[PDB]
Amino acid sequence: LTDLPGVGPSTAEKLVEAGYIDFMKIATATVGELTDIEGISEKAAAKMIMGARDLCDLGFKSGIDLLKQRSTVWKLSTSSSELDSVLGGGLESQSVTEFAGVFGSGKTQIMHQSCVNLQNPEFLFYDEEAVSKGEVAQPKAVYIDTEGTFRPERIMQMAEHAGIDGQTVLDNTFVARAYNSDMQMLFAEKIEDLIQEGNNIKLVVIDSLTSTFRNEYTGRGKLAERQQKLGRHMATLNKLADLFNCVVLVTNQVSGHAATFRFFVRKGKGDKRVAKLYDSPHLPDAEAIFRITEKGIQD
Ligand SMILES: Nc1ncnc2c1ncn2[C@@H]1O[C@H](COP(=O)(O)OP(=O)(O)NP(=O)(O)O)[C@@H](O)[C@H]1O
Numbered sequence: 203l204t205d206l207p208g209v210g211p212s213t214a215e216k217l218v219e220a221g222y223i224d225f226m227k228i229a230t231a232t233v234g235e236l237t238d239i240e241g242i243s244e245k246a247a248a249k250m251i252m253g254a255r256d257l258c259d260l261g262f263k264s265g266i267d268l269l270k271q272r273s274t275v276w277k278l279s280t281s282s283s284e285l286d287s288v289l290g291g292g293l294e295s296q297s298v299t300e301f302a303g304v305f306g307s308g309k310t311q312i313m314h315q316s317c318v319n320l321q322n323p324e325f326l327f328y329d330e331e332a333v334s335k336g337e338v339a340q341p342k343a344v345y346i347d348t349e350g351t352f353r354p355e356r357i358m359q360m361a362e363h364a365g366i367d368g369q370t371v372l373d374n375t376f377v378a379r380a381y382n383s384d385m386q387m388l389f390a391e392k393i394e395d396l397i398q399e400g401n402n403i404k405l406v407v408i409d410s411l412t413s414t415f416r417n418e419y420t421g422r423g424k425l426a427e428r429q430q431k432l433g434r435h436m437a438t439l440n441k442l443a444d445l446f447n448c449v450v451l452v453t454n455q456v457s458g459h460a461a462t463f464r465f466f467v468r469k470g471k472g473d474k475r476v477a478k479l480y481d482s483p484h485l486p487d488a489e490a491i492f493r494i495t496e497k498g499i500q501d
């Protein structure tokens with residue numbers, strides 16, 4: 203931190219204590235955030251932000267450099283061939299993917315399957331020239347369970363059928379039970395803490411994304427506050443995904459809010475499930491057929 207202009211030893215200490223440890227957070231911070239640190243003037247605040255942006259080369263980029271940025275995105279396999287295809291490879295890091303679906307469509311299954319697949323290194327697709335092994339080494343998952351449907355048994359099961367050690371999945375997945383939107387949001391904001399503590403958080407699951415908000419803001423006479431809070435929650439999620447190059451998944455029970463990728467899942471015949479990609483920034487809408495068995499997502 204003392205590398206930054208306007209940052210002395212005493213200032214560095216305040217910064218690390220206020221949770222500002224890495225350059226990107228400072229580079230992307232506002233003067234307000236930094237001035238609420240006490241002992242930090244605005245001039246010093248503005249100087250370090252400018253410095254952080256420069257040390258992180260956050261300026262205009264063109265030509266080939268535009269390709270390199272996009273190459274830092276790695277993807278997580280879903281164990282479904284058709285789904286990975288419709289996804290253009292698999293679930294993208296640096297983005298928020300949503301699986302909306304009717305009751306029992308498999309939203310929660312996909313979340314569990316994703317935590318398991320994170321532990322199979324061959325399920326993380328990436329350009330080894332833009333993403334080093336170390337960056338995806340000892341990957342960990344954060345599971346914000348708002349429904350109370352996290353099932354370690356399902357994790358163990360999905361894991362064995364994948365030839366992955368179940369306990370290892372459990373040992374590398376942080377679960378937080380949220381009972382309302384307040385807890386749901388705070389847990390997400392605290393993910394930074396797990397990372398500063400040395401945890402290579404690469405997957406974040408929010409199941410469910412909307413249940414709490416709908417339950418608390420029932421009265422459609424204050425839907426504004428609702429949209430606001432949630433919007434702020436999505437901002438936090440998108441930033442988290444970009445800055446920590448990790449995949450963010452969210453579920454939504456349906457039978458408006460921000461989401462980079464949008465799916466609507468429905469039940470087919472028995473095992474069958476039909477997921478429809480109806481919105482994304484660079485891919486055409488498409489359908490993916492797969493099934494949910496004792497092994498998890500397959501085909
Ligand atoms: N151990 C298992 N073996 C085989 N199939 C399973 C197993 N566990 C769950 N399933 C399937 O997963 C379905 C439930 O998927 P689920 O992820 O709970 O849907 P959902 O969309 O999250 N439901 P909801 O949260 O209520 O809206 C079941 O009804 C089973 O068909």
Ligand SMILES: [K+]
Nearest residue numbers: 204206208209
């Ligand atoms: K300095």
Ligand SMILES: [K+]
Nearest residue numbers: 306307469472
């Ligand atoms: K079922």
Ligand SMILES: [K+]
Nearest residue numbers: 461462463482
């Ligand atoms: K979108």
Ligand SMILES: [Mg+2]
Nearest residue numbers: 296297440444
């Ligand atoms: Mg993003």
Ligand SMILES: [Mg+2]
Nearest residue numbers: 309310349351
């Ligand atoms: Mg569910």
